DNA sequence: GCTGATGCGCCGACGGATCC
DNA sequence: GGATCCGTCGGGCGCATCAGC
């Protein structure tokens, strides 16, 4: 069935107005995405912070259009050293972060271009492009090891300031999170191993799935559709993109949106509203 | 400099069998 | 014998490299 994201809630449970809008988008090739007007959509959305995944773009190749964003003028980019045209993440922000870092512990030697950490006054933001398990699950074991390493890294961040983790976490946590759960249990994104990893992430750090917290029983809400077989027009998709929050931030949570109508990638944007 | 072929990475449709 | 299961097949898009000119 088709899906209509409900209206933006912009006030928290206790009545405080949203003061921070974060948008996250796997753009599936930043240069292509810009040619397909993705930045026009971004300007309409006017987030305070924009997190981008799968930029497939080294920083020297960034289109000039990215220089003409006065409201997102603090920009941080990461791409892998030996696999350019794959991976790549970006974080663009209205206000300057206090600290910025890359990777999950040894980026200087493992230059992977998958994770950016930005510390702000009230919280730490992490954006991630989690490694896909691969066609035929050929890189599932690597993914499991990476999940463990990530969980440990994040636990030693959340012990300081509250954490917001966003991005493409490359798993549909539960059956409600994709259209075809039965046929996909041996597929990247819905293996028991990946689903369990997501569960351990929520429990160990700990974190809450913002969208599912607000909409625990809402089906057909996805953020990815394969380019093939007209899947998006049929809303045959997967929810792979998330905002995960420290429990101490739940009173700040106003809404967690899925921007289903925004084209330019095989993922759609997701947007978080917080009252800080 | 430029194009297009190839390589690499990253699952839903459907035909046949099974359930009762 | 309609619904469900399950395993096989055929397939959109972006970006890198390369041959050719
Ligand atoms: Cl940078
Ligand atoms: Mn709306
Ligand atoms: Mn992609
Ligand atoms: Mn399958
Ligand atoms: Mn040349
Ligand atoms: Mn070409
Ligand atoms: Mn059929």
Structure in a nutshell:
The protein is an alpha+beta fold. The protein has helices at 30-35, 38-45, 140-158, 192-204, 210-214; strands at 20-26, 49-53, 74-78, 89-93, 99-102, 115-119, 124-129, 163-168, 208-209, 241-245, 253-258, 270-274. Helix 3 (140-158) packs parallel to helix 4 (192-204).
Count of spatially separate domains: 1
Number of strands: 12
In the CATH scheme, the class would be Alpha Beta
Q: And the CATH topology?
A: Deoxyribonuclease I, Chain A
Quaternary structure annotation: monomer
Q: Whole-Å distance between the termini?
A: 36 Å
Helix share bin: 10-25%
PDB class: hydrolase,lyase/dna
Keywords: HYDROLASE and LYASE - DNA complex, hydrolase, LYASE-DNA complex
Assembly: trimeric
Entry title: Human APE1 phosphorothioate substrate complex with Mn2+
What does this structure look like?
By secondary structure, this protein is α+β, with helices and mostly antiparallel strands. The chain is built from five helices and twelve strands. The chain has helices at 30-35, 38-45, 140-158, 192-204, 210-214; strands spanning 20-26, 49-53, 74-78, 89-93, 99-102, 115-119, 124-129, 163-168, 208-209, 241-245, 253-258, 270-274. It has one domain: 4-Layer Sandwich (Deoxyribonuclease I, Chain A), CATH 3.60.10. It is 18% helix and 22% strand. The chain is globular and about 45 Å long. Strands 3-4-2-1-12-11 form a six-stranded mixed sheet. Helix 3 runs parallel beside helix 4. It binds a DNA duplex (20 and 21 nucleotides) through loops.
